[PDB]
Structures are given as structure tokens and as C-alpha cells.
């Protein structure tokens, strides 16, 4: 509620880079007089709940793949996946494991999660070869090609990414029967942060 609301103000998710992009006008609140955009974060929180309700609908959690190609997204995606039932792909994305049926990696999902579409674009491309819905953590200048649910966040930030995955995992856990809404959590956020 209001405590969860205060929990995300402090981190630096709200700031988004330059290159405003056209498809994120509704997701940006304005550009600061310095020249750096900022995100409403109310839409971020709401779209966060909504993406979690997307994810929870998958009966087999192992059919959700969260990918990352950034050094400080790898810890977040790995530990979010191991908290939930999803299975992650950090580091380099082999450019064939969604369309090639012979390579040993494969492991096609029913749902994909992307930390940043611009850096993980290859997986986004492969998704449109096998009908993977794709949910992406898009920021001010991230392209929206083959992106269905985009939450407006910041992808460059260490703490921004860590907190974003923290609330994602927390909210899907609430959606599950694991924990009631009113209980205050016990897993602390900085454990997601890249050292």
C-alpha cells in the first residue's frame, strides 16, 4: 500500500534518459529542465501488477524465461528466477535457441522477460518466430518492437533494475498463495543488487 509506495520512491527508477522516443509519451511524465525525462511511476507500479498477473497465469512457472545481457542485470534475473519458478538466461544469448530445434540449449518458453529490449533485441526477434508474448523493462529510449507489456522503468540503473525485479518477484509471490498482502516482507532488496 502506502508503505510499498514509499519503498520505490527512494531508488532512482523514476529518472529516464534522453531520446524521449515517440511510443513512450504516455509513460513519461515530462522532461526535467536539465534535460532528463522522468516516469510517472504510478503507471510503472500499475503495469507491474499487471505484468505479474500475466506471469502468474502461466500454470508451469518453468515455461517463463527471463533474459539479460547486462552485467548488473544477471544477478537480478538469476535470483528473481530462482525465487519464482521461472528459469533465466543471463550473459550472452545464443542466437538460435528459440528457432533451432537441434541445438542443445533450446528451452523455448511460453513467456519471455527482457531487461532492456535494445540490448536483448536478438531474443525479442526470435520470440516473433514462435509466438512468445514478451514483457520488457523499457526506458525512455527503448524500442517497442515485439513488446506487448512494457513497464516504464530505468534499465541503466543498478538499483533500478534490482528494485524492479524485486517488486516483480514480490508481487507474483503475493499473487500466489505464498504470502498474504498485509504481511511485511523479510527478504531485503539489496540482496538483488550487483556487487
Amino acid at each position: 500500500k502506502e508503505e510499498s509506495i514509499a519503498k520505490m520512491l527512494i531508488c532512482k527508477v523514476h529518472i529516464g534518459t534522453k531520446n524521449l522516443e515517440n511510443k513512450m509519451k504516455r509513460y513519461v511524465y515530462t522532461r526535467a529542465k536539465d534535460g532528463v525525462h522522468i516516469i510517472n511511476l504510478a503507471k510503472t507500479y500499475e503495469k507491474l501488477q499487471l505484468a505479474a498477473r500475466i506471469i502468474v497465469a502461466i500454470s508451469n512457472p518453468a515455461d517463463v524465461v527471463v533474459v539479460s545481457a547486462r552485467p548488473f542485470g544477471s544477478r537480478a534475473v538469476l535470483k528473481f528466477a530462482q525465487y519464482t519458478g521461472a528459469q533465466a538466461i543471463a550473459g550472452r544469448w545464443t542466437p538460435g535457441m528459440l528457432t533451432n530445434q537441434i541445438i542443445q540449449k533450446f528451452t523455448e518458453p511460453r513467456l519471455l522477460i527482457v531487461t532492456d529490449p535494445r540490448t536483448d533485441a536478438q531474443s525479442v526477434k526470435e520470440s516473433a518466430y514462435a509466438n512468445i508474448p514478451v514483457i520488457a523493462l523499457c526506458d525512455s529510449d527503448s524500442p517497442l518492437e515485439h513488446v506487448d507489456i512494457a513497464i516504464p522503468c530505468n534499465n541503466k540503473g543498478k538499483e533500478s533494475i534490482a528494485l524492479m525485479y524485486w517488486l516483480l518477484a514480490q508481487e507474483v509471490l503475493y499473487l500466489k498463495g505464498v504470502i498474504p498482502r498485509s504481511e511485511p516482507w523479510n527478504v531485503m532488496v539489496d540482496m538483488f543488487l550487483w556487487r
Partner: peptide, 28 residues
């Protein structure tokens, strides 16, 4: 992949900008 990174795993384990205030006052 052996036990030489496991213990490292647990070792690893363990006002504001003017626009944003009016922003939050607008939001609630």
C-alpha cells in the same frame, strides 16, 4: 563447476529534485 565458488556465494549474500515533489503531490 566445483565447490570453490559456493562459499563465495554466501559471502556475496551477506530535498529531492524539484519536479518530482510537485509530481508526487499531484499523484497522491
Amino acid at each position: 563447476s566445483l565447490k570453490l565458488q559456493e562459499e563465495e556465494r554466501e559471502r556475496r549474500l551477506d530535498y529531492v529534485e524539484p519536479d518530482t515533489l510537485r509530481m508526487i503531490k499531484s499523484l497522491g
